[PDB]
Design a protein around this ligand. Structure first.
Ligand SMILES: *[C@@H]1O[C@H](CO)[C@@H](O)[C@H](O)[C@H]1NC(C)=O
Ligand SMILES: OC[C@H]1O[C@@H](O)[C@H](O)[C@@H](O)[C@@H]1O
Ligand code: NA
Ligand code: NA
Lengths: 252, 29, 6
């Protein structure tokens, strides 16, 4: 997160840290969508040209966290994963289309002041909120810039940008499974997700019911916070049928 | 099903420091 | 450096 600020305690209680067992390191963000499932970006898990291919035995997830490095006794939980599931039509060869993955916990996690899932959206909540200019929120322990690493979860609020603008500012092929978001140079304000933020959530608060919904997943960008450029996010509602299909059959 | 209501915020009628900017963007423009 | 659990 670049030009963000410190999260407040409990501000983002579905926020999840994807964590390599050995060597120990922060891999990505992720999110708690129920007591049994974490949501993330595929390129967090599998990216064959960099020899990325993390099985479940390789990772842990840490939930409830605030500080980046500290072990937060009496606040965080740590869980082993049962299984990973990457979108089968995930396109790493070109543009990271369908850059989504599911992860199933071995044990259901207990909720608390710090551990609470977020909603996924319905068609309506999708229609209503996914609009040029409407703002959402990205949280992450990623790079402060393109020192370095933050001490605590960082937050920034960003406007959704209209498809033509998004399309016309990268030379990569946008699919309808992506959206982009960030401010434009003439809008003054700054802000972007960065390395280490991948896989973490882009949320919006519905004014119909007061719930936070995850409309996006940090997927990619070119550098971080560069003028005329934008963060790309994985359109979660577009892929929601695969999300449910996976849960219904492996939710157990 | 209790998805998205935060214990430290919404469940106790407390707003965070920046969500209003989210809502200002839904109504203004 | 990351602080250990248990
Ligand atoms: C990734 O890991 C799996 C499981 O160990 C392995 O069998 C496969 O060769 C690797 N490649 C994939 C999943 O594309
Ligand atoms: O090495 C890459 C990065 O190094 C940092 O020290 C700078 O602040 C970044 O903006 C730069 O892109
Ligand atoms: Na996520
Ligand atoms: Na920018």
């Amino acid at each position: 997160i670049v030009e963000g600020s410190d999260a407040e305690i409990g501000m983002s209680p579905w926020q999840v840290m994807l964590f390599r067992k050995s060597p120990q390191e922060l891999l990505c963000g992720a999110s708690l969508i129920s007591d049994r499932w974490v949501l993330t970006a595929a390129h967090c898990l599998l990216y064959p040209p960099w020899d990325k291919n993390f099985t479940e035995n390789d990772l842990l997830v840490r939930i409830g966290k605030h500080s980046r490095t500290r072990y937060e006794r009496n606040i965080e939980k740590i869980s082993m994963l049962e299984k990973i599931y990457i979108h089968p039509r995930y396109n790493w060869r070109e543009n990271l289309d369908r850059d989504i993955a599911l992860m199933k916990l071995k044990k259901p996690v207990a909720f608390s002041d710090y551990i609470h899932p977020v909603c996924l959206p319905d068609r309506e909540t999708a229609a209503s909120l996914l609009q040029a200019g409407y703002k959402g929120r990205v949280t992450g322990w990623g790079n402060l810039k393109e020192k370095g690493q933050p001490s605590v979860l960082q937050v920034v609020n960003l406007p959704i940008v209209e498809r033509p603008v998004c399309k016309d500012s990268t030379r990569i092929r946008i699919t309808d499974n992506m959206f982009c978001a960030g401010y434009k140079p003439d809008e003054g304000k700054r802000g972007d997700a960065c390395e280490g933020d991948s896989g973490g959530p882009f949320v919006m608060k519905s004014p119909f019911n007061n719930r936070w919904y995850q409309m996006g997943i940090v997927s990619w960008g070119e550098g971080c916070d560069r003028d005329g450029k934008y963060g790309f996010y994985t359109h979660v509602f577009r892929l929601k049928k695969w999300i449910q299909k996976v849960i219904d059959q492996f939710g157990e | 099903a209790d998805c998205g209501l935060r214990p430290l915020f919404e469940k106790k009628s407390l707003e965070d420091k920046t969500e209003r900017e989210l809502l200002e963007s839904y109504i203004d423009g | 450096i990351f602080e250990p659990p248990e």
